[PDB]
């Protein structure tokens, strides 16, 4: 892992507080997103912004701490990539909104912080050395309506998974 | 006798699914008819199981009894990927030297085109940009029943098509927002929709004038008119081109929080003395332009002097020396030095100074009093009258008295 | 001249903005130096803080601050000859957070209760991340030193607090600041001052009063003069509305008056009477005093002996020997003997136990005052005595 200096010891409480803040910021970001997306979206939320994604890393609550941390690392990597893509798409489509972009940037910063913390913990405790990460395509493009729908569904799934992780850890 | 024209045959038919238009071509058998009789060709465009939507007529004549190809195109109001379209043609010859009756010829054999599904998109068109107030029809092809459709939370009525397809006729659309309005088709368990863009043509850029700070480049700015309501990759792009020389520069819209007025850099060409600019504006809906002719010598705006000192020898009073960047070695200057007394009076005087290289300048004075709480201030102009240069930092360095 | 280690490595984080770290200067070393601050997340570093040459005081950071993530920061200074680095520390930026003061402080009074007050405020946006503890200081309308509230009460995140054991009709000012709960961190600035006011429950113990009578005007008909002092605006507990005095005796008299002023003129008979004075406020249930007016013909009834009044110092101190076993109260009067003009008298009430006191008036110098002491007994006042005394 090429650790420069040993980590702290309160990493568990740190990542718990980070997960709580992530749940809160994710709820707020989802509200802002389905409020600022458009007019036909809030009326048909159950069909447009359903929490169903064709590909998402699963999570096992009954698993061990090491497996839970590995799954959390994979999930936060995927969430960071998808959040960067969605932020780029939203900046391209609607440059007027600013609070949405600020919330997206804050969420990305907190996600990167949690990623660094969990990597530090996993490399200082179990000495995993290296992890396996799979990268995919953009999975959203060439269609404005499909972009919007996929972004809203991804944000809903992210809100659900962060509400689950807040209680899991 | 009864003169019946020969039944024409359709050579080839095609369609452009991008802009939803049809292409028809045929060759009249003029080689058989030697006379130069006038003819008329009528083309009927019938769709959705012989509905006879539109009928056109084209008046032509045989070119000296020869066979030449004629091309005819028409833009359909409904996307070609929504329903089938048939087309047939027939002719009626009218000979001036014929005595018998003349009837209409039989219709050409049927020639239809059907769009085969090659993409996953189900609503047409896709990301179309039209003028505000234009009439457009949206179609949604699918295999299941459609419940309703709505764009501006209106729930407009829907019309039926041949096979399990529906369409909506939205007349006199309204102005769209930064994002296109969603034309969704609520199915039983899914929702398919697209976006439409309604923008205005680019307004003519008014207030097009520009001066120069130095004889090296020109900065010509302007302001747009009415907002086109189009932001993103479809926004307008202004381009300034030169008439005589032909050089052109392009403005960049990278950063989103843009300024109110758009400036533009244009490097000066060696020894022209005459500038005749012509600004261009592009947009997927329209275009505008505006020209202006200025004299770069008289349209000059000097810069404020920086890093100047107030000191001289024990002789007569201070000879100032200011620094002014740029290239003015050919033209002279008219820096008016305003001297102010002890909050009592302020006399005015101006002296001419020839241009020099990119360095400081030199000037002389004449019989200034002792200290008397004197202060200095300079504002340069030019022999050609224009806006005077901005004021610099005031100094009050006094040559020793008594 | 190598610069010494820039030690003492002070650093502070601010809420809503970026952090900044400080250091020590050392000797002048007569050479230009550029301090290069460093950052380290133990996994990835960032840009180095370059201290501006015009004012190289703390730092100029560029990265956003994130909590619950440790970071190692140290100072690096180097002149034209030599290189030396400062020590390293590992701290959490969540502890050095300096919160914002609460805003929109509100104060509302309670009904029928004067000591109990209510204090409501609004917590800042940092209440969701950390636990805030409060420190409230209160003082009266005009005070130099504030009163500290025991910090053991305001030791948790709360939106409202109730103050008690307060005096009625006393305006008070409040202010509050907040910081982290565990005591680690810097205190926030003081909030805006909010005024308040208590209730007006009930007046003081008794509005003491004294009667004045003239001789027989028309064959036994005598005029009585009732006068009383104004209660100061700390015992009346509210604005004075009106005074109410009742009088009844001799099987036939029963009256009540609501005169707004202190002076009222009523003509009574020669028979005795019982006085009872109340002062009604906006609440009610006032207190009542008592006074016994004597009969027609009474003798000296134990006059006062050994009366004295003297200077030394700055106030005429009256004194007398202890009277007989039965004495109710002392109410002495005094006026100045002005030439070619009559005198108007003032008065004040004293308890039965007190035998020496100082008068409270607006006396002047180089004047002669005739102080008369009237001993009040159970069955009417006694024979008074007078004495003259200068001021200076
Ligand atoms: C429309 O045009 C198509 C041509 O694509 C016609 O389909 C032809 O039908 C004849 C006899 O029905 C066949 O011999 C050809 O092989 C078909 N061509 C194909 C499949 O490419 C069709 O008949 C025309 N008319 C209608 C109503 O669809
Ligand atoms: C298309 O609709 C717009 C508004 O929906 C119409 O604009 C109105 O026009 C009337 C008179 O023509 C005005 O009194 C209104 O103030 C206009 N309203 C707005 C919002 O502009 C427009 O006239 C319609 N087009 C046609 C051809 O009728
Ligand atoms: C700039 O030079 C042109 C010469 O080509 C002047 O003439 C204009 O030329 C453009 C060519 O696109 C025409 O569209 C204009 O109608 C012409 N104008 C006239 C008055 O003939 C042009 O006038 C010059 N610019 C200015 C500002 O005078
Ligand atoms: C554009 O500006 C130049 C410079 O001011 C003008 O050139 C001047 O022409 C007058 C003749 O009327 C001469 O007396 C000056 O000496 C010239 N100034 C120079 C050469 O620096 C030129 O005439 C202007 N163009 C027009 C069309 O008026
Ligand atoms: C305190 O009450 C005032 C009303 O008296 C309000 O202050 C507003 O605060 C917001 C955001 O801080 C500003 O945009 C408004 O301009 C303020 N004034 C008004 C009249 O709304 C608000 O209710 C409270 N503010 C705070 C900081 O607690
Ligand atoms: C320096 O250390 C002293 C402790 O003696 C104290 O003033 C503070 O902690 C430090 N101050 C600065 C400005 O670094
Ligand atoms: C600061 O001083 C150092 C001396 O070692 C020099 O190398 C550097 O260029 C100076 N400027 C900055 C911005 O660091
Ligand atoms: C005063 O006495 C009169 C006697 O009838 C009575 O009517 C009135 O209510 C009394 N007022 C008060 C304030 O007690
Ligand atoms: C007289 O009484 C009235 C209330 O009836 C009130 O104005 C005040 O107590 C008195 N007036 C003055 C001038 O003091
Ligand atoms: C004053 O007293 C006399 C008694 O002789 C009588 O007129 C009445 O009681 C009083 N009059 C007034 C106006 O107070």
Numbering used by the authors:
A (entry chain D): 34 to 202
B (entry chain B): 132 to 533
C (entry chain A): 124 to 515
Quote the passages of the study that discuss this structure, keeping the authors' original sentences.
Glycoprotein 130 (gp130) is a signaling receptor shared by interleukin-6 (IL-6) family cytokines (or gp130 family cytokines), including IL-6, ciliary neurotrophic factor (CNTF), cardiotrophin-like cytokine factor 1 (CLCF1), leukemia inhibitory factor (LIF), oncostatin M (OSM), cardiotrophin-1 (CT-1), IL-11, IL-27, IL-35, and IL-39 (1). These cytokines share a canonical four-helix bundle structure in which four major helices (termed helices A to D) are linked by three loops (termed AB, BC, and CD loops), as well as three conserved receptor binding epitopes (termed sites 1 to 3). IL-6 and IL-11 signal through gp130 homodimerization, while other cytokines require another “tall” signaling receptor, such as LIF receptor (LIFR) or IL-27 receptor subunit alpha (IL-27Rα), which forms a heterodimer with gp130 for signal transduction. The extracellular domains (ECDs) of gp130 include an N-terminal immunoglobulin (Ig)–like domain (D1), a cytokine-binding homology region (CHR, D2D3), and three membrane-proximal fibronectin type III domains (FNIII, D4 to D6).
LIF forms a 1:1:1 tripartite complex with gp130 and LIFR, and the signal transduction does not require a nonsignaling alpha receptor. As with the CNTF and CLCF1 complexes, this map’s higher resolution around the interaction core region (LIF, gp130 D2 to D5, and LIFR D2 to D5) permitted full model building and refinement, while the density at the distal domains of the receptors (gp130 D1 and D6, LIFR D1 and D6 to D8) was sufficient for domain placement as rigid bodies. The gp130-LIF interface has a larger buried surface area (1412 Å2) than the gp130-CNTF and gp130-CLCF1 interfaces, which is mostly caused by gp130 engaging LIF N-terminal extension (residues 34 to 42) preceding helix A. Consistent with the crystal structure of gp130 D2D3 in complex with LIF, the LIF N-terminal extension serves as a “doorstop” to hold gp130 in position and creates additional interaction interface, which might be the reason why LIF does not need a nonsignaling alpha receptor. Of the 21 LIF residues forming the contacting surface, R37 and H38 from the N-terminal extension contribute the two highest fractions of buried surface area through electrostatic interactions with gp130E163,E195. W164 and F191 of gp130 also engage LIF analogous to how they interact with CNTF and CLCF1. While gp130 largely covers the middle region of helices A and C of CNTF and CLCF1, it is positioned toward the N terminus of LIF helix A, leading to an increased distance between the bottom centers of gp130 D6 and LIFR D8 in the LIF complex (~34 Å). LIF is primarily docked onto the saddle-shaped LIFR D3 through its helix D and AB loop, with additional contacts made between the LIF BC loop and the N-terminal loop of LIFR D4. In addition to the key residues F178 and K181 in LIF helix D, P73 and K80 in the AB loop also make extensive contacts with LIFR.
